[PDB]
Ligand binder design. Structure first.
Ligand SMILES: CCCCCCCCCCC1=C(C)C(=O)C(OC)=C(OC)C1=O
Ligand code: SF4
Ligand code: SF4
Ligand code: SF4
Ligand code: SF4
Ligand code: SF4
Ligand code: FES
Ligand SMILES: [Ca+2]
Lengths: 905, 213, 589, 145
């Protein structure tokens, strides 16, 4: 389509509205109520442009550009006098009640309303009457509420209710007294409530965790990074000030997370700022602890390692690819062990084998929203892979989108689309041990043990393809539900099968692979998604290595007298008694970590590693995309005593000091080249980001905004002499504002969005090819593997049905978005949000034990008799007890395990 | 409460200043102290500044020399063009990177005793010129006795720094002769002017409004 | 049509003359807010175009400016030729009262331009600075060495990839080896400037007149080749006062750069602020009210009197009579009484704003202005009779370092030297700005010879004329706003900021991220205290300047020095330095 | 829109009432006698229209209360210069197409017609000079001319 704007010809998409077409062309139209992810509603009336039918038309008519299609032959004027006056009048009307709050408002300098007030040129107040006011609500620990600043743009309710399917936010009242919030005080229950702070164009909804230590956006040092709290790999922009991680903003990745994070990623960063973190290497001598610098630590550790007969390494899925590889080079390939348990490793390598050998395409997170039917097997996605649950909700809304497209309704007219669809949606079938948060939109929910969920999957695969192995002993009611699922999946043009390692059973993954294979054999465009546990679970699985049990028995037999543990607490993947005994038997334990873990009470050496905010590296997400995260700040800029290095830097220098008696701190690209030379399956991590020599016209990429303040005062209490800005030899970013952050710069890694006149998160418009699309020079990250030409065979290992047996309780995993991830549960803001510890019981089993709701029961697992209050679970199948995985004392390796001597005590 | 400086231009130290400083106690008997006081009185009441300027701060310093301020009243107007006859170097202006070896050479060509006043924000720290061609403070290589904030400090601020230097000179200990005795230079560790004036500064409540003359 | 509107200046007759001579496809006309026709010409035709402009019927006689620009990060180059770098040539026709800006586009690998030194001899230092700061080579330049940076400097600091701040690099560490190295690099090498060590009969003495000399007006060295006391030749060595002010222009917001404009010519104050705020107001599309114009004119004339008082008294001191500097600095204190009362500061008021001034005039300013206007004329008459009419001063200054109109034009000399040659060119009359056309004042001109004495007495007459302008400012002071009603007036009026939310929003964003200037190029030329001072601003659409080019007159006068003093005694050079009216902040920026 | 006595000889059709700058509407006409102040009548109308806003769109929800407060000031004799021009601009910018639905164009029809036909009653309420700011001691205001 060809449009004319102010006498200039432009080529646009005719299926787009005029506002998104003109913003994609770089033109400036002020707007409030429209969002790229939410569609157009025409509420705020800010986006007015004058429209003409012909070129020889001079009268024109003001229209909403967000509500007007960008068809062929339209003439519009943005800079028309009447349009400019009306847009200024809309800003002035919004200003009549707006509080005088900018100095004490957390949105200031990041506020879309400030930007549009300036953009329209409204700076003179002539309204002289009173401003309306509102009381605020308590919305929980994450979101602060200030309704005085509301402009009634309806973005919050549209996002929260229509997009995120939340139920506890709404709009109340009437004419000029419209109120946006909850029906009463309480915590916002959506797992994606944190996106309101960027969705709201004012300071009504603000980040309370950032508000505790608030700084303005210009004072922030940003870097492009990857969220470390699960395996999805959402792109984040962490920002720091005065040596502490202040905020996590969404970094737009049009392929992965686009505009949205989940609340675990947004608010679970507080472990970075814990005061008990190791900042220096510490060596234990008897009961004394001596702080070493980097060289003495390397020399002493290398001497003890040279004296040792066998050194083994225990990696972790928390650590990056480079750190795990550096440990593997330090100890040797045959002496390297992944830090996860044997069953966890078996499930992870099976998921990897399905992904890169099953012949079925694995979609990126944005691509999930385009699928026509979803079957989730075993994986409680909202608690383990939350952004996948948000994307699945969008895929479910696809049916209303299709019905509206059949009636020639434009895809941005979201209200008409929702009116046409009503309650119709694409089929979603979820299986879990209990109810899920997806059950409100699920066509069916199967609450069953993991063996029974696997058997349901095997039956679905057999009914789709008779060559798949059959399962006998299916009830006619379950058979009818199976035929419902089969008729839904067979009629889908794009079916999606989601599973993962979190269900704790190999057979659930095998059944999901069988269903995907059966759908592929019918010639369907089937996708498969596997949800891993940690940020670099897939990278550790690709790298491989022995299980934690093998490392523990090597230490226990005495064959290994030195162990180097990298970023692993070892209690999440094995019994703490066995781990403590094995680590006490070893004469040398070295722990390279950034968090104060329990295994440093027996560590002879503790290397203060960097967290993700102080390190660079590569992580592999659940769909096999290698993504580079960059260091945010130098921790030694303020505290010169801080010796906190990247884990791969520590281990590379340790290997160098062990071999040639000399210290080599190396560079990141050298380690990356070593990875891609030694491990060919990880060869794609070279292209995840350009190397440290990359420039934009000779200049590096800036980590902080050009108006970054306080350079000659922020360290002045320590010393009046300003030091050099810390140097970044590892990456293409500079630790200063003396660099490039132009929206037209040819790069993919954008540390933060800012454009002149656009200080808010709406500045991401200028960094995209089209608004709501891709970053204009490609999204960062690269897939490690393609879809294989040939698939796998059917897994014939159909399990028998679950049988309750007396005195033996099967542990059903219950994951929590706040609590089940180790580092984010260490954050202090998550303690209020985390549930109280509990044990779930069936009503029949609780009646058999003579136990009511709330009473404490004691059970023993591996010599640990722990007590827990009882919560009654209606949906949990009898013969099981529900346990919160990943909490204090409940390791996720307990998923699928058994229990003895469960009695009331 | 004294810092002792010993210079060593030919020692095993390359970084300027070519000196070592150590915190010591006052070395000061009934006649040597009186004659040291007499020498300090004579030196503090006859301070000949070096006619040396880098930028606008020099204009304010020589403004203090003129009739409306008359720094001659303190006995500090003599304004030598030669570094050999000058006692006080006022770094009055930006320490440009190209000018830094020149400033070092001129400081080297001055003779004992010598004092340094860093006048203005540029000389103090680089000031507003955090820029490629400017040394961020003359105290990166020249030992400085008095710092004057301001851009420029007004002529009476330069006079106030002259009085501050006079109080610092009046209680310093220097060798009475180069043939016999301790040759190191002892400078008293004065109380900061910020902490001295904090009591009367915080007690300020009201100032004149900026609306009248 | 407002004066700040974008114009291509196609109706300028020089465009038609260039079209008839070279053809319509030989050049591209760029529409700017500079007020000047901007013409992109090919590199191969630069000398032909310059020669054609030099030999026009009413010719372009002065190369006003010559510098470079790094266009690699400029995102808004619509209608512009493809360029990684560019070199611009600002040429003035005095008899036409017109000017033109030629622009040459350059690729990154081929960074060489033909030298302009044959057409305009003052292009030598401009090309040395463009080579120093951008790395652009000028082919055929007789000595293309660094002029702002030391000889052992790496890189070209005005390039976009060169870091601005000192804290990007290691802190300055003066060691013995470094001190010896840069002191060797500062040592004059007479073989590199084509000078011999002497004749057969006698040796030439190579003398450092500066950087620490009583007659050098700052950090400034002239290397004198002396035969006895005769100056065989001299090499003025500048760059000792280089502050990176243009680079800082790319480093500060449009508002936060104003104090830097103050310190370009540090005896000028608000005079230095005026061309910058006028050029930014052209970028912002702001027409300031009449009271703003009168306030800015009054502050400019007060600082012109301040600067002229210092200049006249220091000339008298350099000639040998040391008494009038005491009285003249008392007069400067009377001016400073008024200036401190109005702006809160003596030397660098930083008081002009985009769209106006920082505050209204305080109550009782007219009392202080009346006191100064009563105080000044008897003092000035006393200075004239006691020193300027002394025949020993006349014998030290009359006929000393003399040049004519041709020498003034070929070296870019402006201000009192140019008008001492008889050319009646003052910016406040030829191209009126800031409401100067509403004041009646004369422009003093010389008889045809630019003497030391003639330059000083012309500045005395300029002081008297500024007193007349100040009398008119005192008597006819308009009532009205001290800030314009524009949305880009930075900052807004403070009382409305403190009680109105939309004004508070505007203030919040203007002082933090900065005012957004839409992408354009602007230019403002003013009559500063020491000559013609100009700002050339390129906005790329951001809150920071993409390029801030400051043309200062002292650079041109110091380049003129060796032509006008060659073959004179050293005392003549002392008097010449005293009569130029320069400061080295102006020279080195 | 309000109509005067001269429009009483108009047929009650959509087209004929439309050409007279009004609307036939529900065709249930209301008479205004000489004892009714037009400012008070339009204030009552606008109070109804502002409080019956659904709150969806900015011009109606936030511009009708501004007109209500202006008319309240005019009724009390506390109007200030620029109030009538603000009412006229509000009538212009709340017309058809500016708002999401037709509630606000109908709201501003009587206001614009009463200003058109009975402007002398609206100017009678403007008695005080325009003042939006209080004095802040120490800061000199920017006195416009
Ligand atoms: C000595 C009695 C009072 C007179 C003060 C000196 C007269 C004004 C100084 C002029 C001057 C300026 C501005 C100046 O910048 C300079 O370079 C540092 C000089 O050379 C030393 C000067 O002489
Ligand atoms: S929401 Fe925006 S405009 Fe309102 S007080 Fe906060 S920063 Fe200011
Ligand atoms: S709370 Fe924020 S997002 Fe919701 S309507 Fe108000 S301004 Fe819009
Ligand atoms: S879904 Fe996972 S990767 Fe994404 S923000 Fe949440 S915890 Fe982080
Ligand atoms: S501190 Fe200010 S007044 Fe002094 S030299 Fe620097 S810029 Fe000039
Ligand atoms: S004009 Fe209609 S849509 Fe807009 S707020 Fe008023 S009643 Fe609601
Ligand atoms: S953005 Fe179009 S009316 Fe709100
Ligand atoms: Ca690093």
């Amino acid at each position: 389509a060809t449009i004319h704007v102010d006498g200039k010809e432009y080529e646009v998409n005719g299926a787009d509205n005029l506002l998104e077409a003109c913003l994609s062309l770089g033109l400036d139209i002020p707007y409030f109520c429209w969002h790229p992810a939410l569609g157009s509603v025409g509420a705020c009336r800010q986006c007015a442009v004058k429209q003409y039918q012909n070129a020889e038309d001079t009268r024109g008519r003001l229209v909403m550009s967000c509500m007007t299609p960008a068809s062929d032959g339209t003439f519009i004027s943005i800079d028309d006098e009447e349009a400019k006056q009306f847009r200024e009048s809309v800003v002035e009307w919004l200003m009549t009640n707006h509080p005088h709050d900018c100095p004490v408002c957390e949105e200031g300098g990041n506020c879309h309303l400030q930007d549009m007030t300036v953009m329209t040129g409204h700076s003179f107040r002539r309204y002289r009457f009173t401003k309306r006011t509102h009381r605020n609500q308590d919305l929980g620990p994450f979101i602060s509420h200030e309704m005085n600043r509301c402009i009634a743009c309806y973005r919050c309710v549209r996002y929260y209710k229509d997009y995120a399917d939340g139920t506890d936010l709404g709009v109340y009242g009437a004419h000029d007294n419209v109120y946006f919030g909850r029906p009463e005080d309480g915590t916002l229950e959506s797992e994606f409530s944190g996106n309101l702070v960027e969705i709201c164009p004012t300071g009504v909804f603000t980040d309370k965790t950032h508000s505790e230590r608030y700084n303005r956006k210009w004072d922030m040092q940003f870097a492009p990074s990857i969220c470390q709290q699960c395996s999805i790999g959402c792109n984040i922009s962490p920002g720091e000030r005065y040596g502490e991680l202040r905020r996590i903003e969404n970094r737009y990745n049009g392929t992965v997370n686009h505009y949205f994070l989940c609340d675990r990623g947004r608010f679970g960063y507080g472990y970075v700022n814990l005061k008990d973190r190791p900042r220096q290497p510490v060596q234990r001598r008897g009961d004394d602890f001596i702080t070493l610098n980097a060289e003495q630590a390397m020399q002493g550790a290398a001497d003890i390692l040279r004296q040792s007969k066998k050194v083994i390494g225990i990696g972790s899925p928390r650590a990056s690819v480079e750190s795990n590889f550096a440990l593997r080079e330090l100890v040797g390939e045959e002496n390297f062990y992944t830090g996860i348990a044997h069953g966890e490793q078996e499930r992870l390598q099976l998921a990897l084998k399905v992904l890169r050998e099953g012949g079925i395409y694995t979609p990126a997170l944005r691509e999930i929203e385009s699928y026509d039917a979803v079957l989730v097997l075993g994986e409680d996605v909202t608690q383990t892979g939350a952004r996948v649950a948000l994307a699945v909700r969008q895929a479910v809304k696809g049916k209303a989108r299709e019905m509206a497209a059949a009636q020639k309704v434009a895809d941005w007219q979201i209200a008409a689309i929702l009116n046409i669809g009503q309650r119709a949606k694409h089929p979603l079938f979820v299986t879990n041990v209990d109810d899920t948060r997806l059950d409100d939109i699920a066509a069916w929910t199967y609450r069953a043990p993991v063996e029974d969920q696997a058997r349901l999957g095997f039956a679905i695969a057999h009914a789709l393809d008779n060559s798949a192995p059959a399962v006998d002993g299916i009830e006619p009611e379950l058979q009818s539900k199976i035929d419902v699922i089969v008729q839904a999946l067979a009629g889908a043009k794009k079916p999606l099968i989601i599973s993962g390692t979190n269900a704790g059973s190999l057979e659930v993954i095998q059944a999901a692979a069988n269903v995907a294979k059966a759908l592929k054999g019918r010639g369907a465009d089937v996708g498969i998604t596997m949800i891993a546990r940690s940020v670099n679970s897939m990278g550790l699985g690709i790298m491989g290595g022995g299980s934690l049990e093998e490392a523990l028995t090597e230490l226990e037999t005495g064959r290994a007298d030195a162990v180097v543990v990298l970023e692993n607490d070892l209690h999440r993947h094995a019994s703490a008694i066995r781990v403590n005994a094995a680590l006490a038997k070893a004469p040398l334990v070295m722990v390279v970590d950034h968090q104060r873990t329990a295994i440093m009470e027996n560590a002879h050496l503790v290397l203060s590693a960097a967290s993700f905010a102080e390190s660079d590296g590569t992580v592999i997400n659940n769909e096999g995309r290698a993504q580079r995260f960059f260091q945010v700040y130098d921790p030694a800029y303020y505290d010169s005593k801080t010796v906190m290095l990247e884990s791969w830097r520590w281990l590379h220098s340790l290997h160098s000091t062990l071999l040639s008696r000399e210290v080599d701190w190396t560079q990141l690209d050298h380690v990356i080249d070593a990875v891609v030379a030694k491990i060919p399956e990880l060869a794609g991590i070279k292209d995840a980001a350009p190397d440290a020599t990359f420039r934009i016209r000779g200049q590096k990429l800036a980590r902080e905004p050009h108006r970054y303040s306080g350079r000659t005062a922020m360290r002045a209490n320590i010393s009046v002499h300003e030091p050099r800005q810390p140097q970044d030899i590892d990456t293409m970013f500079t630790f200063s504002m003396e660099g490039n952050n132009q929206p037209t710069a040819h790069r993919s890694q954008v540390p933060f969005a800012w454009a002149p006149g656009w200080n808010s998160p709406q500045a991401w418009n200028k960094f995209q090819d089209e608004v709501g699309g891709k970053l204009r020079f490609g999204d960062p990250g690269v897939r490690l593997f393609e879809t294989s030409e040939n698939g796998l065979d059917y897994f014939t290992s159909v399990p028998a049905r679950f049988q309750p047996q007396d005195g033996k309780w099967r542990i059903a995993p219950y994951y929590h978005l706040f609590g089940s991830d180790e580092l984010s549960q260490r954050a202090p803001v998550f303690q209020s949000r985390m549930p109280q510890p509990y044990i779930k019981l069936n009503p029949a089993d609780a009646a058999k034990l003579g136990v009511n709701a709330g009473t404490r029961v004691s059970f023993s697992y591996d010599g640990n008799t722990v007590t827990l209050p009882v919560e009654i679970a209606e949906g949990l199948t009898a013969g099981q007890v529900g346990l919160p995985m990943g909490m204090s004392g409940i390791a996720p390796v307990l998923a699928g395990a058994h229990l003895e001597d469960l009695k009331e005590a | 409460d004294y810092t002792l400086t010993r210079i060593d231009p030919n020692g095993e130290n390359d970084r300027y200043p070519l000196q070592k400083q150590e915190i010591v106690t006052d070395p000061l008997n009934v006649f040597m102290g009186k004659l040291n006081d007499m020498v300090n009185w004579g030196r503090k009441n006859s301070i000949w500044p070096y006619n040396f300027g880098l930028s606008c701060c020099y204009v304010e310093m020589v403004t203090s020399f003129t009739a409306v301020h008359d720094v001659a009243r303190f006995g500090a107007e003599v304004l030598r063009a030669s570094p050999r006859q000058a006692d006080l170097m006022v770094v009055a202006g930006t320490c440009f990177t190209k000018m830094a070896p020149v400033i070092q050479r001129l400081y080297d060509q001055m003779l004992e005793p010598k004092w340094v006043i860093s006048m203005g924000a540029c000389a103090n720290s680089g000031g507003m010129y955090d820029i490629y061609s400017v040394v961020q403070g003359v105290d990166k290589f020249i030992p400085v006795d008095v710092y004057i904030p301001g851009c420029p400090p007004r002529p009476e601020a330069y006079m106030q720094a002259l009085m501050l230097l006079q109080e610092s000179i009046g209680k310093e200990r220097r060798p009475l002769s180069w043939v016999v005795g301790d040759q190191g230079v002892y400078r008293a560790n004065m109380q900061s002017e910020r902490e001295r004036k904090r009591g009367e500064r915080i007690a300020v409540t009201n100032l004149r409004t900026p609306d009248e003359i | 049509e407002p004066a700040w509107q974008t114009r291509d200046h196609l109706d300028d007759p020089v465009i038609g003359e260039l079209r008839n001579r070279f053809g319509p496809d030989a050049f591209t006309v760029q529409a700017t807010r500079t007020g000047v026709p901007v013409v992109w010409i090919k590199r191969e035709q630069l000398l032909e175009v310059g020669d054609f402009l030099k030999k026009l019927p009413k010719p372009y006689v002065m190369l006003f400016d010559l510098h470079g620009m790094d266009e690699r990060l400029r995102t808004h180059r619509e209608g512009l030729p493809a360029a990684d770098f560019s070199v611009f040539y600002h040429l003035i026709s005095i008899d036409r009262n017109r000017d033109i800006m030629l622009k040459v586009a350059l690729a990154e690998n081929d960074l060489h331009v033909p030298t302009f030194t044959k057409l305009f001899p003052n292009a030598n230092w401009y090309e040395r600075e463009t080579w120093d700061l951008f790395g652009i080579t000028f082919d055929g330049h007789p000595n293309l060495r660094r002029i702002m940076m030391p000889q052992t400097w790496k890189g070209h600091p005005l390039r976009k990839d060169y870091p601005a701040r000192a804290t990007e690099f290691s802190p300055f560490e003066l060691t013995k080896a470094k001190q010896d190295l840069e002191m060797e690099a500062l040592t004059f090498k007479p073989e590199e400037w084509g000078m011999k060590r002497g004749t057969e009969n006698e040796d030439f003495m190579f003398l450092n007149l500066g950087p620490n000399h009583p007659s050098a007006h700052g950090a400034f060295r002239i290397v004198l080749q002396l035969d006895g006391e005769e100056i065989v030749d001299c090499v003025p060595d500048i760059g000792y006062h280089h502050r990176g002010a243009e680079k800082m222009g790319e480093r500060q917001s449009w508002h936060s750069y104003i104090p830097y404009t103050d310190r370009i010519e540090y005896l000028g104050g608000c005079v230095n602020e005026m061309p910058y705020v006028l050029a930014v107001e052209k970028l912002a599309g702001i027409t300031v009210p009449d009271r703003v114009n009168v306030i800015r004119v009054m502050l400019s004339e007060l600082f012109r009197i301040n600067s002229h008082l210092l200049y006249i008294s220091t000339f008298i001191q350099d000639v040998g009579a040391m008494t009038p500097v005491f009285f003249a600095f008392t007069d400067r204190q009377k001016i400073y009484d008024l200036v401190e009362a109005i702006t809160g500061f003596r030397m660098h008021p930083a008081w002009f704003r985009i769209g106006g001034v920082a505050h209204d005039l305080p109550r009782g300013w007219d009392r202080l202005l009346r006191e100064f206007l009563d105080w000044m004329p008897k003092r000035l008459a006393s200075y004239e009779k006691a020193a300027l009419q002394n025949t020993i001063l006349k014998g030290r200054s009359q006929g000393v370092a003399a040049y004519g109109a041709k020498e003034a034009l070929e070296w870019g000399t402006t201000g009192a030297g140019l008008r001492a040659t008889g050319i009646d060119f003052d910016v406040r009359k030829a191209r009126p700005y800031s409401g100067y056309e509403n004041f009646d004042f004369e422009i003093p001109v010389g008889g045809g010879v630019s003497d030391c004495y003639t330059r000083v007495m012309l500045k005395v007459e300029e002081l008297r004329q500024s007193l007349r302008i100040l009398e008119q400012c005192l008597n006819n002071m308009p009532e009205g706003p001290f800030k314009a009603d524009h949305p880009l007036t930075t900052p807004p009026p403070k009382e409305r900021t403190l009680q109105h939310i939309e004004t508070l929003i505007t203030h919040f964003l203007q002082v933090s991220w900065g005012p957004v200037m839409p992408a354009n190029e602007s230019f403002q030329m003013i009559e500063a205290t020491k000559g013609i001072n100009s700002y050339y601003l390129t906005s790329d659409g951001s809150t920071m300047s993409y390029r801030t080019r400051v043309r200062t007159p002292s650079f041109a006068h110091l380049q003129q020095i060796p032509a006008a003093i060659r073959g004179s005694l050293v005392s003549d050079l002392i008097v010449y330095l005293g009569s130029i009216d320069f400061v080295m902040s102006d020279v080195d920026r | 829109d309000f109509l005067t006595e001269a429009h009483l000889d108009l047929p009650m059709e959509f087209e004929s009432i439309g050409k007279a700058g009004s609307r036939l509407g529900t065709a249930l006409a209301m008479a205004v006698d000489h004892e009714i102040n037009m400012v008070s009548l339009v204030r009552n109308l606008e109070e109804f229209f502002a409080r019956e806003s659904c709150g969806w769109c900015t011009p109606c929800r936030d511009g009708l209360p501004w007109s209500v407060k202006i008319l309240r000031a005019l009724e009390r004799g506390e109007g200030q210069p620029g109030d009538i021009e603000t009412l006229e601009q509000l009538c212009r910018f709340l017309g058809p197409g500016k708002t999401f639905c037709a509630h606000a164009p109908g709201a501003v029809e009587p206001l614009q017609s009463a200003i058109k036909y009975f402007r002398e009653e609206f100017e009678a309420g403007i008695k005080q000079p325009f003042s939006n700011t209080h004095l802040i001691n120490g800061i000199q205001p920017n006195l416009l001319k």
